[PDB]
Structure formats: structure tokens, C-alpha cells
mmCIF file of C-alpha atoms and ligand atoms in Angstrom:
data_model
loop_
_atom_site.group_PDB
_atom_site.id
_atom_site.type_symbol
_atom_site.label_atom_id
_atom_site.label_comp_id
_atom_site.label_asym_id
_atom_site.label_seq_id
_atom_site.Cartn_x
_atom_site.Cartn_y
_atom_site.Cartn_z
ATOM 1 C CA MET A 21 -4.921 -23.879 -44.493
ATOM 2 C CA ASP A 22 -4.759 -27.431 -43.680
ATOM 3 C CA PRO A 23 -5.397 -27.744 -39.724
ATOM 4 C CA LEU A 24 -2.141 -29.723 -38.871
ATOM 5 C CA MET A 25 -0.231 -27.786 -41.150
ATOM 6 C CA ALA A 26 -1.426 -24.408 -39.843
ATOM 7 C CA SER A 27 -0.381 -25.278 -36.234
ATOM 8 C CA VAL A 28 3.061 -26.248 -37.639
ATOM 9 C CA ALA A 29 3.175 -23.119 -39.451
ATOM 10 C CA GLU A 30 2.329 -20.997 -36.319
ATOM 11 C CA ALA A 31 4.909 -22.899 -34.426
ATOM 12 C CA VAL A 32 7.537 -22.171 -37.021
ATOM 13 C CA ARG A 33 6.640 -18.543 -37.482
ATOM 14 C CA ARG A 34 7.286 -18.191 -33.741
ATOM 15 C CA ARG A 35 10.993 -19.260 -34.189
ATOM 16 C CA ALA A 36 11.548 -17.352 -37.580
ATOM 17 C CA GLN A 37 12.857 -14.013 -38.009
ATOM 18 C CA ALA A 38 11.480 -12.768 -40.987
ATOM 19 C CA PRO A 39 7.619 -11.659 -42.159
ATOM 20 C CA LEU A 45 2.998 -19.218 -45.870
ATOM 21 C CA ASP A 46 4.356 -21.339 -48.493
ATOM 22 C CA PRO A 47 4.141 -25.090 -47.589
ATOM 23 C CA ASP A 48 7.287 -25.376 -49.929
ATOM 24 C CA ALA A 49 9.461 -22.567 -48.177
ATOM 25 C CA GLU A 50 12.469 -23.633 -46.695
ATOM 26 C CA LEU A 51 13.064 -22.969 -42.861
ATOM 27 C CA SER A 52 16.411 -22.024 -43.138
ATOM 28 C CA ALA A 53 15.247 -19.194 -45.591
ATOM 29 C CA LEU A 54 12.825 -18.189 -42.734
ATOM 30 C CA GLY A 55 15.671 -17.743 -40.548
ATOM 31 C CA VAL A 56 15.100 -20.561 -38.262
ATOM 32 C CA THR A 57 18.291 -21.330 -36.634
ATOM 33 C CA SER A 58 19.446 -24.473 -34.467
ATOM 34 C CA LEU A 59 18.159 -23.012 -31.253
ATOM 35 C CA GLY A 60 14.916 -22.130 -33.150
ATOM 36 C CA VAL A 61 14.380 -25.732 -34.249
ATOM 37 C CA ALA A 62 15.120 -26.723 -30.585
ATOM 38 C CA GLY A 63 12.322 -24.474 -29.575
ATOM 39 C CA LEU A 64 10.193 -25.806 -32.487
ATOM 40 C CA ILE A 65 10.547 -29.244 -31.438
ATOM 41 C CA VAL A 66 9.557 -28.516 -27.559
ATOM 42 C CA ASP A 67 6.419 -26.675 -28.603
ATOM 43 C CA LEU A 68 5.174 -29.462 -31.076
ATOM 44 C CA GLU A 69 5.891 -32.073 -28.579
ATOM 45 C CA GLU A 70 3.930 -30.260 -26.036
ATOM 46 C CA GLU A 71 1.002 -29.334 -28.507
ATOM 47 C CA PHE A 72 0.493 -32.787 -30.042
ATOM 48 C CA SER A 73 1.697 -35.108 -26.886
ATOM 49 C CA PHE A 74 4.282 -36.993 -28.904
ATOM 50 C CA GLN A 75 8.225 -37.158 -28.605
ATOM 51 C CA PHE A 76 10.602 -36.387 -31.437
ATOM 52 C CA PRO A 77 13.272 -39.121 -31.902
ATOM 53 C CA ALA A 78 16.947 -38.067 -32.155
ATOM 54 C CA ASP A 79 17.423 -39.355 -35.678
ATOM 55 C CA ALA A 80 14.428 -37.405 -36.680
ATOM 56 C CA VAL A 81 16.379 -34.339 -35.845
ATOM 57 C CA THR A 82 17.759 -33.376 -39.379
ATOM 58 C CA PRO A 83 17.802 -30.859 -41.756
ATOM 59 C CA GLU A 84 15.695 -33.269 -44.318
ATOM 60 C CA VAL A 85 12.722 -33.386 -41.675
ATOM 61 C CA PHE A 86 13.038 -29.592 -40.848
ATOM 62 C CA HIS A 87 13.805 -28.795 -44.657
ATOM 63 C CA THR A 88 10.188 -27.204 -45.407
ATOM 64 C CA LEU A 89 7.026 -26.828 -43.784
ATOM 65 C CA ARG A 90 5.629 -29.921 -45.836
ATOM 66 C CA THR A 91 8.486 -31.927 -44.826
ATOM 67 C CA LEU A 92 8.033 -31.110 -41.081
ATOM 68 C CA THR A 93 4.222 -31.605 -41.081
ATOM 69 C CA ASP A 94 4.525 -34.864 -42.901
ATOM 70 C CA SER A 95 6.893 -36.113 -40.074
ATOM 71 C CA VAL A 96 4.708 -34.601 -37.369
ATOM 72 C CA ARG A 97 1.660 -36.474 -38.590
ATOM 73 C CA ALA A 98 3.612 -39.640 -38.966
ATOM 74 C CA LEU A 99 5.406 -39.463 -35.499
ATOM 75 C CA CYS A 100 2.244 -38.759 -34.149
ATOM 76 C CA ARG A 101 0.567 -41.946 -35.728
ATOM 77 C CA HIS A 102 3.260 -44.371 -34.702
ATOM 78 C CA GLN A 103 2.973 -43.304 -31.091
ATOM 79 C CA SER A 104 -0.613 -44.611 -30.480
ATOM 80 C CA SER A 110 1.006 -47.233 -42.349
ATOM 81 C CA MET A 111 2.983 -44.009 -42.867
ATOM 82 C CA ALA A 112 6.365 -46.146 -42.060
ATOM 83 C CA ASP A 113 7.479 -44.783 -45.449
ATOM 84 C CA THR A 114 7.748 -41.384 -44.249
ATOM 85 C CA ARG A 115 9.012 -42.438 -40.603
ATOM 86 C CA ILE A 116 11.861 -44.577 -42.013
ATOM 87 C CA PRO A 117 13.422 -42.436 -44.834
ATOM 88 C CA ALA A 118 14.938 -44.043 -47.602
ATOM 89 C CA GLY A 119 18.297 -43.003 -48.921
ATOM 90 C CA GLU A 120 22.047 -42.920 -48.555
ATOM 91 C CA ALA A 121 21.839 -39.341 -47.040
ATOM 92 C CA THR A 122 20.055 -40.362 -43.947
ATOM 93 C CA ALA A 123 22.442 -43.413 -43.476
ATOM 94 C CA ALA A 124 25.543 -41.504 -43.857
ATOM 95 C CA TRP A 125 24.928 -40.813 -40.290
ATOM 96 C CA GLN A 126 25.941 -43.502 -37.656
ATOM 97 C CA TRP A 127 26.482 -43.643 -33.897
ATOM 98 C CA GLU A 128 29.047 -45.711 -32.240
ATOM 99 C CA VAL A 129 30.406 -46.386 -28.544
ATOM 100 C CA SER A 130 33.730 -44.759 -29.437
ATOM 101 C CA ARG A 131 37.182 -46.772 -28.884
ATOM 102 C CA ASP A 132 39.884 -44.279 -30.297
ATOM 103 C CA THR A 133 40.866 -42.020 -27.732
ATOM 104 C CA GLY A 134 42.900 -39.454 -29.847
ATOM 105 C CA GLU A 135 40.228 -39.364 -32.105
ATOM 106 C CA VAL A 136 37.850 -38.287 -29.252
ATOM 107 C CA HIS A 137 40.351 -35.772 -27.685
ATOM 108 C CA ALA A 138 41.198 -34.124 -30.941
ATOM 109 C CA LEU A 139 37.238 -33.575 -31.553
ATOM 110 C CA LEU A 140 36.938 -32.307 -28.069
ATOM 111 C CA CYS A 141 39.553 -30.004 -28.328
ATOM 112 C CA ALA A 142 38.802 -28.550 -31.508
ATOM 113 C CA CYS A 143 35.070 -27.608 -30.350
ATOM 114 C CA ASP A 144 36.308 -26.572 -27.076
ATOM 115 C CA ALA A 145 38.757 -23.975 -29.115
ATOM 116 C CA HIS A 146 35.844 -22.672 -31.423
ATOM 117 C CA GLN A 147 33.511 -22.000 -28.792
ATOM 118 C CA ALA A 148 36.007 -20.221 -26.494
ATOM 119 C CA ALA A 149 36.785 -18.092 -29.531
ATOM 120 C CA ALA A 150 32.975 -17.546 -30.147
ATOM 121 C CA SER A 151 32.262 -16.548 -26.601
ATOM 122 C CA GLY A 152 35.379 -14.792 -25.504
ATOM 123 C CA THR A 153 35.958 -17.393 -22.992
ATOM 124 C CA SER A 154 39.012 -19.536 -21.923
ATOM 125 C CA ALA A 155 39.011 -22.977 -23.270
ATOM 126 C CA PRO A 156 38.545 -25.843 -20.653
ATOM 127 C CA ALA A 157 41.794 -27.775 -19.483
ATOM 128 C CA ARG A 158 41.129 -31.250 -20.920
ATOM 129 C CA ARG A 159 42.879 -34.258 -19.276
ATOM 130 C CA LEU A 160 43.968 -36.879 -22.031
ATOM 131 C CA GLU A 161 43.874 -39.441 -18.943
ATOM 132 C CA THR A 162 40.289 -38.523 -18.611
ATOM 133 C CA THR A 163 39.693 -39.183 -22.026
ATOM 134 C CA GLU A 164 41.583 -42.563 -21.857
ATOM 135 C CA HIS A 165 39.267 -43.296 -18.830
ATOM 136 C CA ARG A 166 36.119 -42.640 -20.589
ATOM 137 C CA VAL A 167 36.899 -44.363 -23.914
ATOM 138 C CA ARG A 168 37.812 -47.668 -22.134
ATOM 139 C CA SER A 169 34.752 -47.343 -19.711
ATOM 140 C CA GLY A 170 32.430 -47.082 -22.706
ATOM 141 C CA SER A 171 30.973 -43.883 -21.917
ATOM 142 C CA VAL A 172 31.808 -41.919 -25.105
ATOM 143 C CA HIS A 173 29.390 -41.828 -27.875
ATOM 144 C CA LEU A 174 30.042 -40.575 -30.952
ATOM 145 C CA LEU A 175 28.183 -39.494 -34.381
ATOM 146 C CA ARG A 176 30.008 -39.887 -37.382
ATOM 147 C CA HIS A 177 28.824 -38.575 -41.041
ATOM 148 C CA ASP A 178 30.663 -40.535 -43.903
ATOM 149 C CA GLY A 179 33.362 -41.951 -41.494
ATOM 150 C CA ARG A 180 34.127 -38.633 -40.286
ATOM 151 C CA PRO A 181 33.614 -37.527 -36.578
ATOM 152 C CA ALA A 182 30.749 -34.888 -36.169
ATOM 153 C CA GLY A 183 29.312 -34.943 -32.578
ATOM 154 C CA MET A 184 29.586 -36.712 -29.394
ATOM 155 C CA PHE A 185 29.011 -37.045 -25.976
ATOM 156 C CA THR A 186 30.114 -38.638 -22.493
ATOM 157 C CA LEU A 187 27.756 -40.370 -20.061
ATOM 158 C CA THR A 188 28.611 -41.644 -16.945
ATOM 159 C CA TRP A 189 27.424 -43.037 -13.510
ATOM 160 C CA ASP A 190 30.521 -41.170 -11.791
ATOM 161 C CA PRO A 191 30.074 -37.285 -11.684
ATOM 162 C CA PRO A 192 32.597 -36.158 -14.156
ATOM 163 C CA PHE A 193 32.706 -32.733 -12.184
ATOM 164 C CA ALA A 194 32.644 -31.762 -8.259
ATOM 165 C CA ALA A 195 29.281 -30.580 -6.739
ATOM 166 C CA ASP A 196 28.254 -30.445 -3.591
ATOM 167 C CA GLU A 197 25.219 -32.145 -1.952
ATOM 168 C CA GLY A 198 22.109 -30.080 -2.677
ATOM 169 C CA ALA A 199 23.545 -28.830 -6.088
ATOM 170 C CA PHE A 200 20.971 -31.129 -7.737
ATOM 171 C CA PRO A 201 17.513 -32.412 -6.852
ATOM 172 C CA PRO A 202 17.675 -35.991 -5.611
ATOM 173 C CA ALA A 203 17.431 -39.036 -7.684
ATOM 174 C CA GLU A 204 17.750 -42.491 -7.096
ATOM 175 C CA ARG A 205 19.914 -43.209 -10.284
ATOM 176 C CA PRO A 206 21.380 -40.082 -11.784
ATOM 177 C CA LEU A 207 23.281 -40.169 -14.815
ATOM 178 C CA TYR A 208 26.062 -37.514 -15.936
ATOM 179 C CA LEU A 209 26.629 -35.639 -19.102
ATOM 180 C CA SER A 210 29.685 -34.212 -20.096
ATOM 181 C CA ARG A 211 31.973 -33.385 -22.995
ATOM 182 C CA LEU A 212 29.029 -32.664 -25.423
ATOM 183 C CA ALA A 213 31.107 -31.659 -28.506
ATOM 184 C CA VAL A 214 30.431 -30.968 -32.223
ATOM 185 C CA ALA A 215 32.998 -30.623 -34.996
ATOM 186 C CA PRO A 216 33.552 -26.879 -36.054
ATOM 187 C CA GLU A 217 32.159 -27.516 -39.577
ATOM 188 C CA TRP A 218 28.995 -28.369 -38.107
ATOM 189 C CA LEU A 219 28.971 -25.458 -35.808
ATOM 190 C CA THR A 220 27.234 -23.315 -38.654
ATOM 191 C CA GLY A 221 24.132 -22.494 -36.273
ATOM 192 C CA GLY A 222 21.564 -24.714 -38.450
ATOM 193 C CA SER A 223 23.499 -27.932 -38.813
ATOM 194 C CA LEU A 224 21.177 -29.554 -35.791
ATOM 195 C CA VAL A 225 24.614 -31.718 -34.984
ATOM 196 C CA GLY A 226 24.411 -30.566 -31.416
ATOM 197 C CA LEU A 227 20.453 -30.825 -30.794
ATOM 198 C CA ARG A 228 20.691 -34.254 -32.324
ATOM 199 C CA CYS A 229 23.682 -35.408 -29.917
ATOM 200 C CA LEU A 230 21.696 -33.599 -26.841
ATOM 201 C CA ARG A 231 18.732 -35.737 -27.581
ATOM 202 C CA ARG A 232 20.522 -38.718 -27.976
ATOM 203 C CA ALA A 233 22.166 -38.290 -24.787
ATOM 204 C CA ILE A 234 18.577 -37.859 -23.242
ATOM 205 C CA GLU A 235 17.370 -41.004 -24.861
ATOM 206 C CA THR A 236 20.440 -43.070 -23.682
ATOM 207 C CA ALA A 237 20.440 -42.080 -20.355
ATOM 208 C CA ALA A 238 16.510 -42.949 -20.413
ATOM 209 C CA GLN A 239 16.944 -46.332 -21.603
ATOM 210 C CA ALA A 240 19.874 -47.226 -19.108
ATOM 211 C CA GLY A 241 17.357 -46.750 -16.349
ATOM 212 C CA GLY A 242 18.432 -43.187 -15.028
ATOM 213 C CA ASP A 243 15.807 -41.192 -13.308
ATOM 214 C CA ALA A 244 17.769 -37.813 -13.731
ATOM 215 C CA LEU A 245 20.653 -36.362 -16.387
ATOM 216 C CA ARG A 246 22.911 -33.991 -14.453
ATOM 217 C CA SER A 247 25.121 -31.671 -16.191
ATOM 218 C CA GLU A 248 27.996 -29.000 -15.399
ATOM 219 C CA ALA A 249 27.620 -25.942 -18.084
ATOM 220 C CA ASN A 250 29.584 -22.508 -18.531
ATOM 221 C CA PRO A 251 26.620 -19.944 -18.786
ATOM 222 C CA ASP A 252 28.944 -17.868 -20.894
ATOM 223 C CA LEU A 253 28.750 -20.284 -23.622
ATOM 224 C CA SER A 254 25.450 -18.723 -24.183
ATOM 225 C CA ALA A 255 24.174 -20.586 -27.265
ATOM 226 C CA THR A 256 24.685 -24.064 -25.458
ATOM 227 C CA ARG A 257 23.476 -22.853 -22.198
ATOM 228 C CA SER A 258 19.988 -21.734 -24.320
ATOM 229 C CA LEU A 259 20.132 -25.286 -25.827
ATOM 230 C CA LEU A 260 20.150 -27.006 -22.549
ATOM 231 C CA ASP A 261 17.326 -24.518 -21.075
ATOM 232 C CA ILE A 262 15.037 -25.364 -23.774
ATOM 233 C CA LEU A 263 15.302 -28.944 -23.588
ATOM 234 C CA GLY A 264 14.363 -28.820 -20.245
ATOM 235 C CA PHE A 265 17.482 -28.897 -18.279
ATOM 236 C CA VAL A 266 16.575 -26.806 -14.898
ATOM 237 C CA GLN A 267 19.198 -24.683 -13.007
ATOM 238 C CA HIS A 268 19.334 -25.748 -9.435
ATOM 239 C CA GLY A 269 21.281 -23.260 -7.123
ATOM 240 C CA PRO A 270 23.034 -20.416 -7.714
ATOM 241 C CA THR A 271 25.652 -19.681 -10.215
ATOM 242 C CA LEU A 272 29.327 -20.231 -9.313
ATOM 243 C CA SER A 273 32.045 -18.227 -10.274
ATOM 244 C CA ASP A 274 35.873 -17.819 -9.810
ATOM 245 C CA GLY A 275 37.830 -14.987 -8.781
ATOM 246 C CA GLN A 276 38.454 -13.896 -12.222
ATOM 247 C CA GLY A 277 34.946 -14.145 -13.237
ATOM 248 C CA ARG A 278 34.790 -17.634 -15.286
ATOM 249 C CA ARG A 279 31.562 -19.235 -14.176
ATOM 250 C CA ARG A 280 29.552 -22.773 -13.997
ATOM 251 C CA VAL A 281 26.096 -23.829 -13.264
ATOM 252 C CA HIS A 282 24.573 -27.090 -12.395
ATOM 253 C CA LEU A 283 21.853 -28.140 -14.560
ATOM 254 C CA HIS A 284 19.311 -31.268 -13.946
ATOM 255 C CA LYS A 285 16.580 -32.707 -16.297
ATOM 256 C CA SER A 286 14.059 -35.326 -15.386
ATOM 257 C CA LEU A 287 14.014 -38.786 -17.251
ATOM 258 C CA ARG A 288 11.407 -41.495 -18.231
HETATM 259 CL CL1 CL B 1 22.139 -20.919 -33.413
#
């Protein structure tokens, strides 16, 4: 095979669940959302480049051909193929990021995602304060991804810790930022939409552009899919797993930046 495409094909078969055609769809190979996350981390390690959040789309990860072409383009740019790096068409442009200004919209999205993931994991949905949503939205901390006008995913990014955590729960850092309320609309939680992966990468990029040297988070490890996602993208757990008298748990995660 062609060398770059051969490397990409090996990376893909690592994250597949089936026994290679350049025009084969990754989804048909059984590559899931977590699969794509591991694929991105492998390729970034192998070829010493960084995947942009807006390249985390089912269009880039459609087939082995599209993925290989995107890898080639991204590698070239981070050192001509601008036609590939800038994808033409209305489907790409249907996805738009904003700093949210609509409290009710944010709170409805958060609660829908919470309830869905609680049903899927067998855990209690967290209690969300509308006053917290109001404070976050007025602060400019909520970043929301729309598709065709309808909210799809979001994250909250603050200088203040949005959760209690002792000293030493995290490695030291000069300007840490905090991630909370990462949420995806139920319709995109099919396990292959990549919306959550895209929002998480966007939070990493935004925190890095803000001058942060660390991104801190509190995660429920019993939401095992998101826990794995955080782990694949390099969030390291510092200190032991906290747990209540009724078995509900939380862990503190730290990811280095810039
Ligand atoms: Cl998944």
C-alpha cells in the first residue's frame, strides 16, 4: 500500500472491531467515538501534528481515503493542500460555535444530557442549579456548538473552580482553567457522532489560547464512556477516587496545556 495510507490503515485496524479498502467506511469497520479518539491520539503521536477540533467530523473520518488525505494536509500545513484543509460545502458550515447568551437553552441541554447519561450508566443525575447556569452564561464561560440552529454540544470553562477540591487534588499550575458541564444533546449520543470529542478538543484549544497551563476537571468514573474519553485525550487522575456513603463517585483530572 501507499506508506502514509498504510500507517493510517494500521492505526484504524487497531480501533476496529471487524477483520483493506481505501473507500471502506470507518463506521462499517466498527470504529466508535472512543475509537476515533484513540485514532486521533495515535496519529498525532506518530506524525507529530495536531488535529484541529473542526477536523473532528464524520466527513474527515468517513473512509480511509478521506482520513489519509486529511492527515497529509494537516501535516503539510503545520511545518498547497488548502482545498482539503478548508472543506467546501454547506454541511461543514452547518456547525457553528458561539459564546452562549441563553440561560434556558443551556440549562435544558445540560439536563437532557445528564438524564440520558444517568439512564445509560445506572447512576443518579447530578443536581444542577439554574443560578449556576445564569452565572456561567453571564460570565461568558459557556461555549455552545449549534448545528443548523439547534444546540448540539457545549462546555463551561472558568477560572474559578466549579467544584470543591482540596489542595493537592491536582498538580501545581500557574494559571489553571476548569472544565465543567460538558454536554451533548441526546440525538448526538449515538456513539459515533463525534460531537462530544469535538467539544472536548475545543475546550482544550480554548483553554490553551486563554493562556492556561492546565485544564482541571471533575468526572464521574461511573459514566465510563466519558471517563475513557477524558483518559484517551490525556486527562491524568491525581489522587484517589472519592466516593460517598452510597457509592456515588468522583475523580479529579488534570491535563497539561501549551
Ligand atoms: Cl462510543
